[PDB]
Amino acid sequence: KEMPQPKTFGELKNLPLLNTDKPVQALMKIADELGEIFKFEAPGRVTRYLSSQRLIKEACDESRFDKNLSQALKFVRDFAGDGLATSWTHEKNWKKAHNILLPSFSQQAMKGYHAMMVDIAVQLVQKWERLNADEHIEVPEDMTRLTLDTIGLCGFNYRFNSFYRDQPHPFITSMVRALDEAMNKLQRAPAYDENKRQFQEDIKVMNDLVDKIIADRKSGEQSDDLLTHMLNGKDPETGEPLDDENIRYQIITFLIAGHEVTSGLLSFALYFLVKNPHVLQKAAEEAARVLVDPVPSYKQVKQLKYVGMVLNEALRLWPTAPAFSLYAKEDTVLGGEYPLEKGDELMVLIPQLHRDKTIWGDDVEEFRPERFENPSAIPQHAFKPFGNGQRACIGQQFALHEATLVLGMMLKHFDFEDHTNYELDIKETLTLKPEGFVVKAKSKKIPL
Amino acid sequence: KEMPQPKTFGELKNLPLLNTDKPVQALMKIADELGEIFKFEAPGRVTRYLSSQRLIKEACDESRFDKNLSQALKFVRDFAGDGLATSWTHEKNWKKAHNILLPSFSQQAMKGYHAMMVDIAVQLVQKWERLNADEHIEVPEDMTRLTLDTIGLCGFNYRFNSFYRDQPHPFITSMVRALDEAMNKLQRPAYDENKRQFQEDIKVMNDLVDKIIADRKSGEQSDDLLTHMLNGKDPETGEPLDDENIRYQIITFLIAGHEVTSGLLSFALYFLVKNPHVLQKAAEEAARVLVDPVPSYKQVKQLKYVGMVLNEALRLWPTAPAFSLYAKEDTVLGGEYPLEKGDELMVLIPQLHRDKTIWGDDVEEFRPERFENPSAIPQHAFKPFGNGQRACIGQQFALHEATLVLGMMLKHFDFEDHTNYELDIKETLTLKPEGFVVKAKSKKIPL
Numbered sequence: 058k059e060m061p062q063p064k065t066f067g068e069l070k071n072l073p074l075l076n077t078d079k080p081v082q083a084l085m086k087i088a089d090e091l092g093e094i095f096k097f098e099a100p101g102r103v104t105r106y107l108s109s110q111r112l113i114k115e116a117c118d119e120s121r122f123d124k125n126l127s128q129a130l131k132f133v134r135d136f137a138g139d140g141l142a143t144s145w146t147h148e149k150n151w152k153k154a155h156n157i158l159l160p161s162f163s164q165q166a167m168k169g170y171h172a173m174m175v176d177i178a179v180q181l182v183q184k185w186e187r188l189n190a191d192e193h194i195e196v197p198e199d200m201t202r203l204t205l206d207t208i209g210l211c212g213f214n215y216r217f218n219s220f221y222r223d224q225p226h227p228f229i230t231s232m233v234r235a236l237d238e239a240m241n242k243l244q245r246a247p248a249y250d251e252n253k254r255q256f257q258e259d260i261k262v263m264n265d266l267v268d269k270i271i272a273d274r275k276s277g278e279q280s281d282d283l284l285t286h287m288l289n290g291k292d293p294e295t296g297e298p299l300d301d302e303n304i305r306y307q308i309i310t311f312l313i314a315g316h317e318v319t320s321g322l323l324s325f326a327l328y329f330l331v332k333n334p335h336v337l338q339k340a341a342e343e344a345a346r347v348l349v350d351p352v353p354s355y356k357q358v359k360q361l362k363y364v365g366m367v368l369n370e371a372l373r374l375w376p377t378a379p380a381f382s383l384y385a386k387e388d389t390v391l392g393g394e395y396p397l398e399k400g401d402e403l404m405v406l407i408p409q410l411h412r413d414k415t416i417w418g419d420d421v422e423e424f425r426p427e428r429f430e431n432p433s434a435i436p437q438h439a440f441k442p443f444g445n446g447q448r449a450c451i452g453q454q455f456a457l458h459e460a461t462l463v464l465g466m467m468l469k470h471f472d473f474e475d476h477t478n479y480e481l482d483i484k485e486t487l488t489l490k491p492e493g494f495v496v497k498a499k500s501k502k503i504p505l
Numbered sequence: 506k507e508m509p510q511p512k513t514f515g516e517l518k519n520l521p522l523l524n525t526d527k528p529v530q531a532l533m534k535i536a537d538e539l540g541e542i543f544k545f546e547a548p549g550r551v552t553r554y555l556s557s558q559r560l561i562k563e564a565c566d567e568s569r570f571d572k573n574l575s576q577a578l579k580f581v582r583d584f585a586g587d588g589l590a591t592s593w594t595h596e597k598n599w600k601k602a603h604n605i606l607l608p609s610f611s612q613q614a615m616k617g618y619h620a621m622m623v624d625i626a627v628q629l630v631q632k633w634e635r636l637n638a639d640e641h642i643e644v645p646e647d648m649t650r651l652t653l654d655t656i657g658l659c660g661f662n663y664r665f666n667s668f669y670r671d672q673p674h675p676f677i678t679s680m681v682r683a684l685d686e687a688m689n690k691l692q693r694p695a696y697d698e699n700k701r702q703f704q705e706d707i708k709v710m711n712d713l714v715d716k717i718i719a720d721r722k723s724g725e726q727s728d729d730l731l732t733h734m735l736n737g738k739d740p741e742t743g744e745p746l747d748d749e750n751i752r753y754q755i756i757t758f759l760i761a762g763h764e765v766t767s768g769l770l771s772f773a774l775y776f777l778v779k780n781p782h783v784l785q786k787a788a789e790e791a792a793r794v795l796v797d798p799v800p801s802y803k804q805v806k807q808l809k810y811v812g813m814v815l816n817e818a819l820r821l822w823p824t825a826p827a828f829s830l831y832a833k834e835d836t837v838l839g840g841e842y843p844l845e846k847g848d849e850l851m852v853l854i855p856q857l858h859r860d861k862t863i864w865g866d867d868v869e870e871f872r873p874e875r876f877e878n879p880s881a882i883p884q885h886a887f888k889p890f891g892n893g894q895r896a897c898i899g900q901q902f903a904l905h906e907a908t909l910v911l912g913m914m915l916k917h918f919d920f921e922d923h924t925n926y927e928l929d930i931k932e933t934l935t936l937k938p939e940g941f942v943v944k945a946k947s948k949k950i951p952l
């Protein structure tokens with residue numbers, strides 16, 4: 058009944074614990090000492106970090122808990138607005154955009170996005186086959202190039218052409234810097250006057266590009282992208298279409314939730330593959346037996362079951378969206394021993410949930426894709442890499458299909474060597490990525 | 506591209522080849538002569554028996570192949586009904602019962618069954634320590650007593666009390682006889698008596714099970730499969746299983762439980778006493794882990810090598826020796842065998858597990874160390890529990906029960922193959938080593 062709490066720092070309480078370049082991993086270490094739940098206190102804020110399936114399965118009860126905007130999401134809201142990810146459930150614009158955007162994110166809608174995904178996937182395979190001998194691949198940098206171009210091509214029919222650059226796009230320079238400042242606000246309290254001047258200067262860069270792209274599209278030209286469905290799609294409930302401001306926030310949202318959070322999955326997947334040669338060969342075998350054409354089809358991607366198992370296990374150990382927030386709708390008791398008042402907040406520490414030994418056994422730290430041989434064997438609310446309930450990831454099928462195609466083509470065309478014996482170092486922005494992860498790719502000389 | 510086929514018998518085609526008391530072993534011998542695939546033809550039926558991991562990994566593609574009811578499963582359906590094992594994937598009651606029964610068969614649900622499994626496991630250990638000198642154990646008969654009592658106690662809180670009997674329960678008297686008739690119809694006024702007895706055997710099973718369902722509905726609750734089915738509702742449709750289907754699930758769980766699982770223990774003990782080094786390695790682990798008079802659920806999960814012994818025994822002699830599949834659409838198998846929509850396939854599991862390209866040249870050797878790393882095992886090479894969504898739902902149940910009991914057996918007894926048993930596999934719908942007997946000299950470790 059008495060909830061533990063980590064070390065305090067006087068008037069700042071537990072806030073200095075977040076003053077670190079790896080906060081998610083720090084909360085994971087705190088969870089190992091304190092267990093399934095611990096109270097976290099800051100000046101003006103209190104939250105409870107959940108780590109066990111026993112309690113998270115209760116927090117996922119939508120009749121008792123709703124999505125809360127964490128302090129990180131409130132800072133992203135300053136440029137993501139009332140987009141799908143940074144809006145409240147009770148706000149009119151969430152349910153409106155949710156109803157309009159569900160058909161464009163279905164598994165059957167991935168058939169229309171497949172050709173543009175293959176476009177960017179071919180550019181990645183061609184870059185790696187044009188490398189010289191002893192040259193290495195910067196894995197997270199190249200995965201971000203692919204993911205960002207994929208969502209740009211599939212979402213707005215816009216080509217960032219990341220494979221033609223070493224310096225990033227002027228849009229994401231402002232974006233990644235706005236995400237950095239938003240994360241740096243997490244552990245605060247004239248000195249930061251420059252930060253604020255740069256923050257609004259970075260917000261205007263994102264708004265002007267998207268609003269110009271929206272105004273340019275509105276030629277009347279159609280396409281198979283997210284952009285067309287938002288100009289002509291109407292919410293069945295209210296009958297209304299999204300206004301011009303909201304569509305801008307959705308595009309910014311899809312670009313953030315697109316590029317490196319999805320690429321982190323590919324980077325972690327490739328890392329765990331080259332660290333487990335048995336799994337690598339088994340996944341490479343499936344890529345060769347299934348992808349029999351120079352260009353993979355939509356059906357062939359769906360046949361890569363073991364590649365999806367590899368992607369699901371990489372999401373287990375290192376989910377790139379490492380947590381989400383919930384608040385109590387009413388007075389309730391959590392786990393029969395932790396009474397919660399209305400409005401009290403919860404945190405779902407996803408990497409810890411996926412390390413519940415009572416769910417996955419003693420071998421939680423091993424990269425074993427065979428845990429996902431049969432999805433019905435996994436308990437309820439034990440695997441939550443994409444959120445929960447109606448507030449779950451709407452682009453889950455987008456990210457999984459894109460990652461399955463690219464990983465299958467990567468395993469089909471290249472042998473991969475961990476030439477540096479990479480020591481895992483997880484860089485923490487708002488997401489997780491293996492910093493400095495490099496590999497060598499000996500081509501298999503299979504043409505496209 | 507041209508598919509081989511064994512010898513034919515005129516208008517009967519290959520059917521007389523099945524007129525034998527060991528058809529699975531006979532089909533295994535045909536695979537050794539004909540290879541990874543051969544056509545099998547009967548009047549009104551044709552199927553293709555797959556034997557290699559190369560082709561079976563394709564047959565396991567659920568987007569291209571679905572579970573088919575083999576001619577044996579069609580005959581079992583006359584009393585197993587639309588239960589989980591004898592229903593088609595498209596029948597509404599399969600997915601309905603599948604959704605309702607998945608949580609009750611989870612690995613976390615084995616914690617609730619553990620105490621009742623230890624109850625029957627202790628009765629087995631006490632019977633064996635109460636034997637007199639020079640008395641031997643009838644291994645498959647005693648393993649069947651344990652597995653039948655386990656599923657009855659864990660599934661319906663009913664005690665068959667098999668260790669208090671010499672003649673089996675009247676329910677399974679009709680059940681084993683109905684399985685005999687169902688298998689003998691496969692290779693068959695002359696049989697008029699069989700049908701009269703067959704309907705008499707079905708009525709005995711239906712009336713008994715329906716009485717237990719009506720008796721439970723006392724209002725009493727429990728941690729058994731029966732309670733999970735009376736109060737559980739399918740999340741998809743919102744509906745609960747009706748009473749006729751619940752009867753079929755209980756009949757299903759009684760068949761698919763005891764004698765398929767008891768074969769695993771009998772084969773496991775056989776392979777243990779034929780390989781004393783493996784026997785000693787597993788007996789050492791049982792002593793190293795089971796430090797309590799009663800094993801806990803946590804301790805069973807730590808019997809890693811015992812599980813390898815159980816997995817290797819399932820490799821050589823899987824007790825559910827095959828399953829059936831049909832092509833959902835026109836497809837090509839292996840790039841050389843074109844199949845039309847609806848064409849049937851057979852997965853000869855004991856042959857699949859003897860693929861030298863997967864397990865090496867020592868396929869016939871009992872090496873439990875093959876399963877040290879499941880990621881080292883190729884895809885769809887080890888299929889003792891079926892495939893995909895139609896896989897064994899009691900997989901958990903059977904492995905935990907067999908690991909607990911086998912661990913207690915190795916901890917409490919030294920085992921001697923006093924007759925130097927010659928393996929003789931009796932074939933009903935499953936496989937078991939007939940006449941396998943051993944001596945168990947107790948270690949005098951109390952409970």
Ligand code: HEM
Pocket residue numbers: 124141142143155310311314315318319320322376377378380381382442443444445447448449450451452453455456
């Ligand atoms: C590996 C890839 C991804 C992971 C692990 C992931 C994870 C998540 C998680 C955990 C949430 C819940 C956030 C919360 O509850 O506060 C979420 C929501 C969301 N994600 Fe993703 N995501 C991924 C890729 C994508 C992609 C490709 C898109 C493309 C548009 C996307 C767009 C969104 C949106 C719009 C939401 C908010 C949905 C709503 O609340 O209505 N994400 N994601």
Ligand code: HEM
Pocket residue numbers: 572589590603757758761762763765766767769823824825827828829888889890891892894895896897898899900902903
């Ligand atoms: C050594 C023990 C066991 C083995 C080798 C085994 C094997 C199998 C196999 C191969 C199948 C697939 C049948 C097919 O595809 O046509 C299956 C299905 C099934 N088994 Fe088992 N089994 C065992 C124990 C059990 C136990 C203890 C139960 C307890 C209820 C059980 C219940 C079932 C059920 C209900 C199905 C049908 C599942 C479905 O299709 O939805 N089995 N089993």
Ligand SMILES: *N[C@@H](Cc1ccccc1)C(=O)O
Pocket residue numbers: 075080081127128129240243379380404
């Ligand atoms: N996103 C999680 C973890 C986190 C804590 C502190 C800084 C960054 C990320 C949360 O907000 O609690």
Ligand SMILES: *N[C@@H](Cc1ccccc1)C(=O)O
Pocket residue numbers: 075097099102104127128129130243
């Ligand atoms: N990830 C958490 C971290 C945090 C906790 C408490 C105060 C500030 C930040 C979050 O999203 O807020």
Ligand SMILES: *N[C@@H](Cc1ccccc1)C(=O)O
Pocket residue numbers: 523528529532575576577688691826827851934
């Ligand atoms: N269950 C297998 C093997 C078998 C063949 C003939 C009679 C009994 C069992 C199958 O049905 O093909």
Ligand SMILES: *N[C@@H](Cc1ccccc1)C(=O)O
Pocket residue numbers: 523545546547550551552575576577578691
């Ligand atoms: N076990 C098989 C045996 C069989 C195959 C082909 C024709 C007749 C019988 C089965 O259950 O069908």
